Design a protein around this ligand. Structure first.
Ligand code: HEM
Ligand code: HEM
Ligand SMILES: C[S@@+](CC[C@H](N)C(=O)[O-])C[C@H]1O[C@@H](n2cnc3c(N)ncnc32)[C@H](O)[C@@H]1O
Ligand SMILES: C[S@@+](CC[C@H](N)C(=O)[O-])C[C@H]1O[C@@H](n2cnc3c(N)ncnc32)[C@H](O)[C@@H]1O
Ligand SMILES: Cc1ncc(COP(=O)(O)O)c(C=O)c1O
Ligand SMILES: *Cc1c(COP(=O)(O)O)cnc(C)c1O
Lengths: 489, 486
């Protein structure tokens, strides 16, 4: 196994002629009238001027945006997913029918699974288990296969999202790992194509480039091509808090290492990353990322992700030094398609406490309902006798309780039923196995509004003795609320 | 108010020179290095050859795909949302700071909300109350405002009439009316069809398009019939829609289908059915199947309507021989359908997906007639909501049928629907219950599997046993559980 953070052996140095390069170099391509396949849609991404957000924050300059979400897969990684493969295919490293294994979650695995789906490669994406249903559904739809690795297990560990991919690589015939962190094809893709597009579209003239930093291939290749052909251009790198990628190290000091923004920042310094071509670094957080993302979507009509928001949130700061007549280009990595249920959802933004909006009987208290005396069950009775009673009284449940009255959980009918479809339970065995812990608990002193929210969300909430959370005062559903309302109106 | 199905007054006739046209005509545009705004990204969509699926089903011809999901909003409607506005803006009909009300829940609301967001118009989208979260979240994110309308085409309180009520009540408000507006088919007549002719060098022998409002297929078929006579135009209509001709094809039991964006109960103004050489009937199964097949094999990320288009294409293009060309229209992206046809769980829940891995419980192929269900308790449409709440209190169910005096069941009522409506303030305890009638509901019959029933009761809280149109009763989970665990 080789470490991705292993120091770079590249001898490239500013001033060295391009004739000395040992690598293979491609060029931006004239696109056909009719595309032979969807993969030809990758590249030649549009440059869109930012008209509102630039001026709103007082930028005297021109602010352009390089939109990589118009790539066939809806991310910048479609550039490298193509390149890394097209190189391997040339090298003789990659054969027809082979397997491509990658230790990635969502941003590269999509591009790779797409290219693999088009060209008939088996694709194996290895990642933690709780991966967002958007990315996971896209991958499964493209034909890729997923390996769930444990949520808590280290990078250096033998059971992680990465090491296990290497174990599969060794164990599975014809399997290859392109290794986006170590592969020179990653930054060479942007060095050869992206940076040339940016230079063509800007007529060779721009005074700043702002990019968010992930593996680092993008910002590296771009900054190198620019430093060569456009010296005056300053390169600005963006790093989330909790990441050590940014320089100097003093900026990297923080309490938590966890952030909600996807695609940028992780704990190690990849091989492909060149931090000597980055003129200045900026620290962003999740709040301004998502805020500026919503602002981009709303004001500019640009459908993009949170990393784009980070990039721009930094841009409005870094471009203040720029005056009138100059130009600043930002990199917008991906689309909103992956974040449909995350930063795009107001409920989610509220839950994490980012925007946190404010909130005739709405402020009336649940107490006014005057509910029934609960039917609770022992963990220990059969599922048959269980749904026998729940059929008798037309109630759907239990707080599942111990002998002391302590709540051990809850159980509902539908849960039982799906547990039966899976065949993991049968009427004989104890109900204590089917305990449903994923419901929500709210109680007497709570507002009827929050309850209402849960009632359009779920089937029920659970009134607990106010100051004893292990105690059950009663069970609330929509029918008793409708009872209250229809009663006093 | 004007009806969308009102007959077309257009005097356009095949053979008439283009110099006689009273309308305004644009042309496909050379795009800049740097786009001044995102709206310039609309158009010049790529044409991608279909290499696998064509040959797999035995097509001797070339099958190309016009991908409209690469538009800035991720749908074909971005073309018209632009046009309808750009015309109004020119006409003096549309002023800066105005309000654009549209009663569509379709992609048009997205395109319009985007253009409105970019150009600073207030946007009001009026639609039903279910409305799968993707579209709704996109709209709210773009700055648009939503009105929930608890669906009926010519009703006074619907997704459309109330938009006209707002149009009258709100200053500077306009309704572009995608069904009646000539800008809709003119957008495709002027641009899309010219793109298709440029990319195909003026030669193609068939075009297959799914039919929604009909502006697309109309404008395209007209431009083609003019400049490429040999090209046959093939229209696609879901089952439950009457758009297809002849009328004999439109015969079906249910009028409800899961595919979004195509087929209607009415014939829109902009639709010209005299330029369509042949029509084909598609269903939801082959739509979603071919959509998954497009994504998997061709790497094309698209929607279910695309699947319908292609599912028809592999049939219609069989007449084509080697050397010819067939072009299909792919309307939208998978972005709206992330939790619907893209989800395996959902595909299973609706019964489209294939069942076995080769073993499962014995009651699976038993049927619900064995459950021994009792008589349903029916509610009148004229009853008061509070009364419903009383009866349904005492009996203790979460749902009841809404049926008129003549015996025909107009629908179902669920507590979540009543609560949802009340929280919006669109219903009161003294109101008609006929307001909260819930017309989208799932049917399992007497003779259908206990398995299908199970999948149903994983989607939703009920389904409804019917002896043949007639009924039997209402089924929920606890009867299944009671039967099995017995
Ligand atoms: C005149 C220009 C360049 C020269 C002469 C050059 C030369 C080299 C050399 C000698 C190596 C060592 C390979 C090894 O030790 O196994 C290397 C590696 C590498 N180069 Fe370059 N290079 C040039 C430009 C670039 C550019 C423009 C990029 C990216 C945009 C790049 C990315 C890399 C990467 C990622 C490695 C791998 C380092 C490692 O595996 O540790 N190089 N290069
Ligand atoms: C030589 C070519 C054409 C001529 C002379 C023509 C003429 C007309 C005329 C006289 C009307 C009646 C306006 C009214 O009564 O309000 C009309 C309406 C209309 N035209 Fe055309 N037209 C031509 C081509 C087209 C094309 C190519 C399209 C679309 C692709 C189109 C779409 C419409 C629509 C949607 C209406 C509205 C009909 C209604 O509101 O009931 N026309 N046209
Ligand atoms: C008869 S049930 C009807 C079906 C409804 N979906 C439900 O499960 O509550 C509705 C009434 O029973 C009450 N209820 C539900 N679960 C209960 C439980 N485990 N113990 C006592 N009352 C319960 C509710 O609060 C409501 O007043
Ligand atoms: C008592 S309810 C308990 C709550 C459950 N969620 C429900 O609505 O069915 C369950 C029993 O009532 C039946 N049921 C539900 N709605 C019905 C109605 N409208 N007419 C007759 N039986 C009904 C079910 O089929 C089942 O046998
Ligand atoms: C969403 C997202 N944004 C930004 C980046 C950074 O791109 P790179 O690592 O190529 O510099 C990545 C990777 C990413 O996945
Ligand atoms: C509107 C629509 C169509 C049909 O396009 P028309 O312009 O009505 O002919 C097809 N698919 C989707 C998803 C649509 O929204």
């Amino acid at each position: 196994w080789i470490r991705p953070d292993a120091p770079s052996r590249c001898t490239w140095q500013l001033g060295r002629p391009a004739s000395e390069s040992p690598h293979h170099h491609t060029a931006p391509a004239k696109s056909p009238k009719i595309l032979p396949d969807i993969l030809k849609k990758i590249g030649d991404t549009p440059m869109v001027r930012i008209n509102k957000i630039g001026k709103k924050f007082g930028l005297k300059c021109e602010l352009l945006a390089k939109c990589e979400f118009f790539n066939a897969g809806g991310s910048v990684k479609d550039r490298i997913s193509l390149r890394m493969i097209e190189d391997a295919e040339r090298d003789g490293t990659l054969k027809p029918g082979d397997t491509i294994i990658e230790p990635t979650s969502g941003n590269t695995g999509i591009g790779l699974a797409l290219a693999a789906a088009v060209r008939g490669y088996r694709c194996i994406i290895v990642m933690p288990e709780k991966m967002s249903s958007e990315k996971v559904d896209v991958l499964r739809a493209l034909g890729a296969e997923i390996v769930r690795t444990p949520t808590n297990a280290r990078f250096d560990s033998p059971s992680s999202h990465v090491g296990v991919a290497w174990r599969l690589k060794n164990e599975i015939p014809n399997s290859h790992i392109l290794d986006q962190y170590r592969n020179a094809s990653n930054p060479l893709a942007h060095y050869d194509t992206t940076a040339d597009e940016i230079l063509q579209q800007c007529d060779g003239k721009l005074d700043m480039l702002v990019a968010s930093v992930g593996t680092g291939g993008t910002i590296t290749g771009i900054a190198r091509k620019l430093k060569e052909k456009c010296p005056g251009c300053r390169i600005i790198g963006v790093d989330p808090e909790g990441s050590i990628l940014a320089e100097p190290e003093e900026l990297n000091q923080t309490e938590q290492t966890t952030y909600e923004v996807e695609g940028i920042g992780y704990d190690f310094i990849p091989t492909v990353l060149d931090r000597t071509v980055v003129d200045k670094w900026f620290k962003s957080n999740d709040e301004e990322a998502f805020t500026f993302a919503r602002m981009l979507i709303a004001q500019e009509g640009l459908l993009c992700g949170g990393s784009a928001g980070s990039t721009v949130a930094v841009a409005v700061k870094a471009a203040q030094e720029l005056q009138e007549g100059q130009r600043c280009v930002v990199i917008l990595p991906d689309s909103v398609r992956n974040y449909m249920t995350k930063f795009l959802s107001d409920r989610w933004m509220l839950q994490k406490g980012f925007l946190k909006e404010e909130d005739w009987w709405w402020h009336l208290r649940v107490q006014e309902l005057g509910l029934s005396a609960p039917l609770t069950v022992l963990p220990t009775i059969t599922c048959g006798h269980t749904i026998e009673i729940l059929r008798e009284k037309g109630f759907d449940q239990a707080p599942v309780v111990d002998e002391a009255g302590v709540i051990l959980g809850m159980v509902t009918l539908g849960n039982m039923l799906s547990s039966l479809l899976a065949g993991k339970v049968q009427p004989s065995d104890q109900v204590g196995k089917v305990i449903y812990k994923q419901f929500k608990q709210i109680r007497l002193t709570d507002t009827l509004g929050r309850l209402s929210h849960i009632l359009e969300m779920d089937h029920f909430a659970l009134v607990v003795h106010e100051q004893q959370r292990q105690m059950v005062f009663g069970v609330v559903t929509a029918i008793d609320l409708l009872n209250f309302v229809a009663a006093q109106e």
